[PDB]
Every structure is written in C-alpha cells, then in structure tokens.
C-alpha cells in the first residue's frame, strides 16, 4: 500500500510498504529516498511515536495515511 509522510518543511512523501513491514523497514525507505537515518526520524502517527521493530499492522496504518516525521529533539 501507499503511505504519505511529512517533515518540518511541509513536504509530502509517498512510499510503498505493507502492513506486515516493520518500522525499521519504513526508516530504510526514508534513507533510500530522503537519505535520513532511522534514529533521526520521529514518526508520530495520531500523536503516538512508532517504535523501531513494530509492524504497521501493529499500530493502525491504513491505505494512504499521514504521519508527522520530526527530527530527534535533544533529550533522549
């Protein structure tokens, strides 16, 4: 399926990932397209941050959704 992603620039991205895939994989796509490190991408879908190792189907990702990708902010 397709998934829409946005950053701190308002740029919308389009990637192809299955509900079986895991966050880790998603990050890989962000690296193969935008070239951004996995730990440098904060996916806050619906307000919740995706954990590296969980499957899209383990959260609630539907066909063509929207996620806010923010850079890791100081702290931890």
UniProtKB/Swiss-Prot annotation:
Subcellular location: Cytoplasm; Nucleus
Source superkingdom: Eukaryota
Outcome when changing residue 65 to A: Prevents phosphorylation in case of mitophagy. Impaired translocation of PRKN to mitochondria
PTM characteristics: Phosphorylated at Ser-65 by PINK1 during mitophagy. Phosphorylated ubiquitin specifically binds and activates parkin (PRKN), triggering mitophagy. Phosphorylation does not affect E1-mediated E2 charging of ubiquitin but affects discharging of E2 enzymes to form polyubiquitin chains. It also affects deubiquitination by deubiquitinase enzymes such as USP30.
Record PTM ADP-ribosylglycine, positions in chain: 76
Effect listed in the UniProt record for changing residue 76 to A: Loss of ADP-ribosylation
Described function: Exists either covalently attached to another protein, or free (unanchored). When covalently bound, it is conjugated to target proteins via an isopeptide bond either as a monomer (monoubiquitin), a polymer linked via different Lys residues of the ubiquitin (polyubiquitin chains) or a linear polymer linked via the initiator Met of the ubiquitin (linear polyubiquitin chains).
Entry protein name: Ubiquitin
Species in which this protein is naturally found: Homo sapiens (Human)
Residue span relative to the full protein: 1 to 76 of 128
């Amino acid at each position: 399926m397709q998934l829409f992603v946005k950053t701190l620039t308002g740029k919308t991205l389009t990637v192809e990932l299955e509900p079986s895939d895991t966050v880790e994989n998603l990050k890989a796509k962000i690296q193969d397209k935008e070239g951004i490190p996995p730990d440098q991408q904060r996916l806050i879908f619906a307000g919740k941050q995706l954990e590296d190792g969980r499957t899209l189907s383990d959260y609630n990702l539907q066909k063509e959704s929207t996620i806010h990708l923010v850079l890791r902010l100081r702290g931890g």
